[PDB]
Design a protein around this ligand. Structure first.
Ligand code: HEM
Ligand code: HEM
Ligand code: HEM
Ligand code: HEM
Ligand code: HEM
Ligand code: HEM
Ligand code: HEM
Ligand code: HEM
Ligand SMILES: [Ca+2]
Ligand SMILES: [Ca+2]
Ligand SMILES: [Ca+2]
Ligand SMILES: [Ca+2]
Ligand SMILES: [Zn+2]
Lengths: 147, 162, 165, 145, 149, 161, 140, 145, 140, 147, 149
């Protein structure tokens, strides 16, 4: 349960395969497919995003959201080489979720499972373990005070 | 990249996907002469070893690496590749002699004269291995234990056959 | 400063073990007789050759003659051959043939097959000579005259062991 | 063993990007594929008699090949836009109906593609996924299943 | 559990820890740094002051302590420099365990704190610091050292 | 050795000016600069080149014959032998079928076993083949832009024996 | 006016310029430094994220978060419905502070100056100006 | 032939910096030194029976070695701070008194260090200087002269 | 406030940044140029050392002498008794001229700006500001 | 008696061995050890530094001085590659000593001997001659009008 | 006495003196430069004007003198370009001595001055100038040239 440097390298690459195009289309479908798996398992969470209009999947008010989530993840990964900064924004990323009433420590462990089930389908050569390891370290710090 | 030179007197470059496919693709046909399409390397039971000195994925101090071929067939209609299966074994504790043995899948590229193997998918997700036999003959190779995912070099070992 | 072992079981060894008497490499290539042939720099061996200057002296292409005077090998530290030698340089100056020679002290390192010869404090300011026997044999070596400090190369010198017949 | 859905599409669409490539890699990629196809069903050579199917290396055929993959590109490159794909496939469907092409050949051509693509991608390549999608694309050209 | 402080991980630590000893006045540094590190420890946990009493911690600049500052700081060096030889490092650390076992008063919670302190200090003297790599390694070290209390 | 100097090799190296190789004077201690002065491409000889990389020739031909018509060495300047050569070519398209035999001047420098064949056509394209040193029955022939010295065509030439 | 090509051009150039991992922090830093030296009035609202010391991790984090958002917006230039939404979303996170609309005109000035260095002469100033502008006004 | 004064200290302190080095160079530097020591006085192996002195390559001993040089470092690294050095030496003095270590061994160990250091530094190395200082440091550990 | 580490950090970074031989003159030059372009009022007191032409040897010399003193001060941050003395000594060599105390605040601004470029993102702004500042006030 | 380019290179290196640390301690002891040799030979000069309090060796008012001297030398050496500037500051360095009443042309030749006796003891591989040569060229110009 | 204008020394001079002849219009340069050099000499020491009278120094731009400007300036070239072959350079310069010996009126003090002038001029046309190296070499040259007067 330690995010090794090698593992970081693994991810810093794995990502370059999902976050290839500079066109929303792809990243969207993936992040979406991730959430759909979160909702199919922890339906409760669904309600939390009425603010962004999840009832209107193709809304755009919501699509944009998905992107922000995606990009927020992108930002994390693309910080794995600058530890100190990552450690800070990682905190800031927590606070943005602590003030979001209704976000459990569980929902996170849930979205984690999500990726681990989606990613292995959108690209080949996915080191599920390596991902899982460093993703957990990231999640843990984000929802340390969330439950 | 994706091209290798004919073995003829004229250093012409043809695509990897064209060596040993039954049709003279090189100016002189060097891409089809036996000295090129020798299966000598991909023969069942073939084994190459050297001293693996790790530089990126495991404590381990230089230990013996052994990539050996376990089975290999060549689809009748697609000769360019000799699909195969092998095993990569490397010593763990030089003292009690524990040793890791991951099963691999992959092929052998006639063009690049390179052996490319990766783990079978679902067995502790170990390593892969790339061996170049550009050393002149069919018994010496420049192998490097990689991480399947990114082909990133976990360790390197110059190997010999037997 | 490291020694590469057999092309099969490749691995690095510190030249403080280069050839110390204890099997350090997996293939023991770091004790293989041929690596530590004392004969390369046997006392009495003489190396000559042309010294072309391009760095710290206005000298005409002359010849240098490195000849090993003595050679001790501490029984409790074999990794090095300590040695004394005589460096002569038959060069032409104001008028006729002169000879600028000096006594030197230094060592031979098996690992790199390097021979370093420094002046025996000869306060006449002579350039330390340095030879590498990278040529596949113990007969020929590639040398350079250099400043003991920077090891900056003042001249190129390719020597050959003189025949004894 | 799997259906060419949303994800499996994105995967093939991506992997195809790498295998297809460009320039010479392409002129060969196609070459290889066809050689693999004809090697399986030599009977089919007779259909491309119009575009020098006798000599796979003849410019006419080279064009043809590079031209075929072209469509396959459009197909794959739009597995995430059912609306459009539908159209391209339908378009192809037409250029093909009329020619007595047995489901037998399409099968071989798929196999060909798969084997070559696998040879080209080395390690990162999901077989089932491609199979599923190449299938869905072929179905759209035959009309059958 | 085996991905903690990996080859790359420590290869990094080692590289970064070397940025420090570039100048010959290592003593002045090691001391000052180690001095501060121990001080800031006694600051957050005083029951420590009594442990380091034996080495006149009362006089930070006092040779008695300055020497100590080295020994410890220098021990950490040993640990780091043996990171690429687990068996040796292991032995090296186990030995450190025993040297701390017979020093009553020293409890685990002390190391946990020292670790947090060390982690906040390093990045202040090293411009290039990889928190993740370091924490991973420092943990393994500090733990094995206090595994006897 | 420097840019414009000739290496004499041996177990004791010496750099002398390329303008001294095969000049009649013993400039090198060992003598290399004077013991190997045999002209490879001499009158009567023919060389067949097999293309393998052509990005400029007007015909992008499969082969290319190189016939040496005459060769004379100036009695007082042995380091350079002047040549007269006919570069033959067998092209063949759909709209036609051409044959060519462009003539060009050129020299061979014992200095570095490199024959330079001045541009035949006024398209700034010349041939430059450098010999092995020990072979003389095969040389790589680079077709270049005289002015630039850009390589844009490589042919392996074999002596037609 | 940022049409179809004028976007792709930026979407593309942004890629090369921005970069990956550290290469970015470097960019962000270089950017904000030039901005703050020109108009020190900005160190004010950046008080929460140690704007006095731009080299600090606190600010560094911020720096990145910013560029990231910029990345998003740029990656939405082709899809209007998402951009219009995203932009509106950004405007809110800003309006809540005393922000002279001219600050953005400044930010833009530099962002272009910097990309200028990074990209060189190939830098399609026109495309960017026309395009990034459209992203600023939606937040100004 | 010379005393470990102010300057001679600075020199050794500096040269030691180069010879000591780090990483593997260190793990060897120490290795070499001990091998040279034990080769001189095999009798002494008996003292390090506790830390696998029988096999110089055993981790336990590797540690020990690397651990010893460590002290020597502190010593040398403070030849310009008599106050502190004094302390370190004294500290060592204790960890050693009690063990029947004859001035005979220290002598060999010095020789070892010197020979290895000389082998490591190549040309820039003052013998007398080191001899003088290694001596002063050893004296501080024995108590004698 | 410049304690023990905050110094070593500067002492260390100064090394890499400043450099050796020519690498320095380059530094000095780059520094003074940026300073004089920002506040040409300074070309005045530098009249003795051809401040009009900073590329001149006369000024070049000066430039170096300056940086050197800065080196000294920095190398004394650990020893207070020497610094306090050295600083006092520098103050004298300056006070004798019409020197607006703000000039130094300027000098500092740039010295940091420059080191920023040289050192990159690793540059510990905090440490420097806290530390070099103390050196200026002792001369201001 | 000519400072060759090679010699400059020799020194530009020899120095990098004495002026290693960015901590006063070392340079101090050396420059001091140099002066102690100047005073033991030309005791008269001692008086000249009462202004810096030489009577208080560890003063600090004096230590700082030593450093300034050291650094002034450092500055010289580190200028050997920029001739023209060196030639000017070299003059400026003279003027700073001409206005110092009591400084003889001799005292300089004396401090020169000093280094030549000290340096060879603080570091090995010291090309005393090379140093001597370029040091003289430096001194000559400094005390051309000093006697 | 043998460390003056060493291999590195002149290797430098040679390299720096070449920065000049990069463009084909060497004549325009050599002339203008040599012209100025001689002029600035007659400026500081007039008894010179009478020596160069023979070459119409009165008309600086006059071909008569322009030619001369070359010959001299070009001779300096020869000197510099033979710096890496002492025996040759020696001979080459000795010859120059004789060409000046039979020209009465030319005294040593002239060269000393011309040297100072040349040393102040070069650095004005060459961005990269190593005063030390040049002075060392120019001295050796100027001296050997005037060693007969
Ligand atoms: C993989 C880790 C996650 C990342 C990287 C992430 C990222 C983000 C980001 C960037 C925002 C938008 C902040 C803004 O622009 O105002 C956000 C908001 C939010 N996140 Fe997450 N998030 C993650 C996981 C989760 C999980 C597991 C939940 C729980 C279901 C969650 C619930 C929310 C909600 C409801 C919002 C508010 C959106 C709105 O109404 O504007 N997040 N998240
Ligand atoms: C998914 C696979 C296939 C795709 C995407 C495909 C695509 C194409 C395309 C784009 C053309 C060129 C149309 C034109 O520009 O005129 C073409 C022509 C043709 N295809 Fe296919 N095709 C596929 C499978 C097959 C198979 C299995 C056969 C039979 C072995 C076949 C037989 C033909 C023939 C004979 C032609 C016309 C040749 C000519 O132009 O004279 N195709 N195909
Ligand atoms: C990773 C950091 C640490 C290292 C590597 C380390 C190293 C050392 C070393 C080398 C000694 C000297 C043994 C000897 O030569 O006799 C020592 C002693 C000691 N250590 Fe640690 N130590 C560390 C952390 C701690 C912590 C967290 C505490 C705090 C309670 C601690 C308390 C002590 C005490 C009290 C002594 C006795 C010193 C004396 O009086 O001689 N150490 N340590
Ligand atoms: C076009 C470029 C800009 C974009 C895309 C942008 C984007 C952002 C983003 C995403 C945040 C982070 C919000 C959060 O996660 O809490 C932010 C915060 C902020 N922005 Fe901007 N911004 C831009 C320009 C500006 C300008 C011109 C100013 C300068 C005065 C400014 C002032 C702020 C401030 C003060 C904050 C909040 C700092 C804090 O979190 O304490 N932004 N900006
Ligand atoms: C200047 C040279 C020497 C220095 C600096 C020195 C330093 C050290 C140090 C630091 C230790 C480890 C103490 C600990 O952490 O427990 C040690 C242990 C020891 N030293 Fe020395 N030592 C020196 C010479 C010698 C000599 C000549 C011998 C005898 C051949 C010797 C025999 C021992 C023994 C037997 C141990 C204890 C081994 C153990 O831990 O079981 N030392 N020495
Ligand atoms: C913190 C950086 C500064 C340091 C450490 C410093 C250091 C020095 C030193 C050592 C000298 C040379 C004295 C000599 O040898 O004659 C000098 C001279 C001088 N400084 Fe500064 N200085 C600094 C900042 C300033 C500033 C801000 C100004 C700009 C107005 C300034 C104006 C002068 C002037 C006018 C001189 C005399 C020039 C001359 O010699 O004719 N200094 N400074
Ligand atoms: C190796 C050449 C020398 C160098 C590089 C050197 C350098 C310096 C420097 C930089 C200063 C300080 C200027 C200032 O900051 O105000 C100075 C001052 C002075 N120098 Fe030298 N110096 C050298 C040799 C000598 C010698 C041989 C003497 C004669 C004994 C001497 C006597 C003095 C005196 C007395 C001062 C005045 C110090 C004071 O009262 O502030 N210097 N020197
Ligand atoms: C290093 C610089 C100098 C060089 C290399 C040099 C070179 C020459 C050369 C080549 C000639 C022409 C000989 C011929 O072709 O007949 C010449 C002539 C002469 N030089 Fe110099 N010269 C130098 C310095 C001087 C100086 C310092 C004086 C100044 C008194 C001087 C005075 C003359 C005179 C009077 C002539 C006679 C020209 C005539 O009327 O033909 N030269 N010099
Ligand atoms: Ca073929
Ligand atoms: Ca390792
Ligand atoms: Ca050995
Ligand atoms: Ca000849
Ligand atoms: Zn000699």
């Amino acid at each position: 349960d330690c995010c090794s440097y090698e593992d970081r390298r693994e991810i810093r690459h794995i990502w370059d395969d999902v976050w290839s195009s500079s066109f929303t289309d792809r990243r969207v479908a993936i992040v979406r497919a991730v959430f759909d798996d979160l909702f199919k398992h922890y339906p409760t969470s669904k309600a939390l995003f009425e603010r962004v209009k999840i009832d209107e999947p193709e809304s755009g008010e919501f699509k944009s959201h998905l992107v922000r989530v995606a990009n927020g993840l992108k930002l994390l990964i693309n910080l794995l080489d600058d530890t100190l900064v990552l450690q800070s924004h990682l905190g800031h990323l927590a606070d943005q979720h602590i003030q979001r009433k209704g976000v459990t420590k569980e929902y996170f462990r849930g979205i984690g499972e999500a990726f681990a089930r989606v990613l292995p389908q959108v690209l080949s050569c996915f080191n599920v373990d390596a991902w899982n390891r460093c993703f957990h370290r990231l999640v843990a710090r984000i929802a340390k005070d969330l439950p | 990249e994706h091209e290798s030179e004919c073995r003829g007197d004229v250093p012409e470059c043809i695509h990897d996907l064209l060596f040993c496919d039954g049709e003279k693709d090189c100016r002189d046909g060097s891409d089809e002469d036996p000295e090129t399409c020798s299966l000598n390397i991909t023969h069942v039971g073939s084994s190459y070893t050297g001293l693996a000195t790790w530089t990126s994925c495991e404590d381990l101090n230089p230990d013996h690496a052994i990539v050996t071929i376990t089975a290999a067939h060549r689809k009748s209609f697609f000769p360019n590749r000799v699909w195969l299966r092998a095993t990569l074994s490397y010593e763990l504790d030089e003292h009690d002699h524990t040793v890791s043995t991951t099963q691999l899948r992959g092929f052998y590229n006639f063009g690049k004269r390179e052996l490319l193997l990766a783990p079978l998918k679902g067995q502790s997700e170990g390593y892969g291995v790339i061996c170049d036999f550009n050393l002149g003959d069919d018994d010496h190779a420049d192998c490097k234990i990689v991480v399947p995912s990114s082909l990133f070099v976990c360790a390197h070992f110059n190997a010999q056959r037997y | 400063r490291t020694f590469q072992c057999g092309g099969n079981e490749q691995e690095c060894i510190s030249d403080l073990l280069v050839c110390d008497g204890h099997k350090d490499c997996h293939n023991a290539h770091d004790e293989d007789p041929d690596v530590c042939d004392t004969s390369v720099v046997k006392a009495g061996n003489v190396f000559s050759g042309t010294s072309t200057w391009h760095g710290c002296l206005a000298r005409e292409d002359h010849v240098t003659r490195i000849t090993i005077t003595a050679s001790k090998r501490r029984k409790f530290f074999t990794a090095r051959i300590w040695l004394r030698a005589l460096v002569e340089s038959e060069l032409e100056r104001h008028g006729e043939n002169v000879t600028s020679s000096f006594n030197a002290k230094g060592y031979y390192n098996f690992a790199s097959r390097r021979l370093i010869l420094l002046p025996t404090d000869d306060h006449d300011d002579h350039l330390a000579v340095v030879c590498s026997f990278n040529r596949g044999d113990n007969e020929r070596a590639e040398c350079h005259r250099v400043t003991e400090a920077t090891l900056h190369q003042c001249a190129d010198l390719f020597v050959t062991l003189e025949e004894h017949d | 063993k799997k259906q060419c859905g949303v994800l499996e599409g994105l995967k093939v669409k991506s992997e195809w990007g790498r295998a297809y490539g460009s320039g010479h890699d392409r002129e060969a990629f196609s070459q290889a594929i066809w050689r693999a196809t004809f090697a399986q069903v030599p009977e089919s050579r007779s259909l491309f008699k119009r575009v020098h199917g006798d000599d796979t290396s003849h410019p006419a055929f080279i064009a043809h090949a590079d031209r075929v993959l072209g469509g396959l590109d459009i197909a794959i490159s739009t597995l995430d836009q059912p609306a459009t794909l539908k159209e391209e496939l339908d378009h192809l469907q037409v250029q093909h109906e009329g020619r007595k092409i047995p489901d037998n050949y399409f099968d071989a051509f798929k196999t060909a593609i798969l084997h070559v693509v696998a040879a080209q991608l080395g390690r990162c390549y999901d077989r089932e996924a491609w199979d599923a999608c190449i299938d869905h694309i072929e179905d759209g050209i035959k009309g059958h299943h | 559990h085996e991905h903690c402080c990996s080859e790359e991980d420590h290869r990094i630590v080692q590289k970064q820890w070397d940025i420090l000893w570039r100048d010959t006045e290592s003593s002045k540094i090691k001391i000052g740094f180690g001095r501060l590190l121990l001080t800031k420890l006694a600051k957050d946990i005083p029951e420590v002051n009594d442990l380091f009493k034996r080495v006149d911690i009362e006089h930070a600049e006092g040779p008695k302590f300055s020497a100590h500052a080295l020994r410890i700081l220098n021990g950490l060096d040993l640990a780091i420099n043996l990171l690429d030889d687990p068996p040796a490092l292991d032995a090296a650390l186990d030995h450190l365990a025993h040297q701390h076992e017979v020093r009553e008063g020293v409890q685990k919670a002390h190391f946990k704190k020292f670790g947090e302190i060390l982690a906040t200090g390093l990045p202040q003297v090293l411009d290039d610091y990889d928190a993740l790599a370091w924490k991973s390694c420092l943990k393994g070290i500090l733990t094995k050292i206090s595994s006897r209390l | 050795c420097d840019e414009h100097e000739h290496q004499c090799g041996g177990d004791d190296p010496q750099c002398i000016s390329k303008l001294f190789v095969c000049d009649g004077h013993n400039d090198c201690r060992n003598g290399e600069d004077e013991k190997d002065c045999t002209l490879p491409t001499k009158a009567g000889d023919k060389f067949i080149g097999d293309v393998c990389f052509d990005h400029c020739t007007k015909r992008r031909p499969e082969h290319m014959t190189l016939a040496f018509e005459s060769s004379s060495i100036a009695a007082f300047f042995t380091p350079i032998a002047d040549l007269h050569v006919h570069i033959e070519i067998e092209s063949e398209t759909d709209e036609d079928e051409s044959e060519v035999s462009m003539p060009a001047d050129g020299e061979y420098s014992f200095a570095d076993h490199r024959l330079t064949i001045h541009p035949p056509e006024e398209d700034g394209l010349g041939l430059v083949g450098e010999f092995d040193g020990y072979n003389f029955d095969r040389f790589v022939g680079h077709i270049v832009h005289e002015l630039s010295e850009e390589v844009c065509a490589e042919f392996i030439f074999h002596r037609k024996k | 006016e940022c049409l179809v090509t004028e976007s792709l051009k930026v979407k593309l150039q942004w890629a090369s310029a921005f970069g990956h991992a550290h290469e970015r922090v470097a960019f962000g830093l270089e950017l904000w430094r030039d901005i703050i030296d020109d108009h020190p009035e900005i160190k004010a609202p950046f008080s929460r994220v140690r704007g006095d010391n731009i080299y600090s991790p606190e600010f560094g984090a911020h720096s990145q978060r910013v560029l990231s958002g910029l990345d998003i917006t740029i990656s939405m230039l082709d899809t209007p419905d998402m951009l219009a939404a995203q932009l509106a979303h950004l405007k809110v996170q800003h309006v809540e502070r005393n922000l002279k609309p001219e600050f953005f005109d400044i930010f833009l000035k530099h962002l272009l100056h910097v990309l200028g260095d990074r990209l060189g002469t190939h830098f399609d100033f026109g495309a960017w100006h026309d395009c990034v502008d459209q992203i600023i006004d939606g937040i100004k």
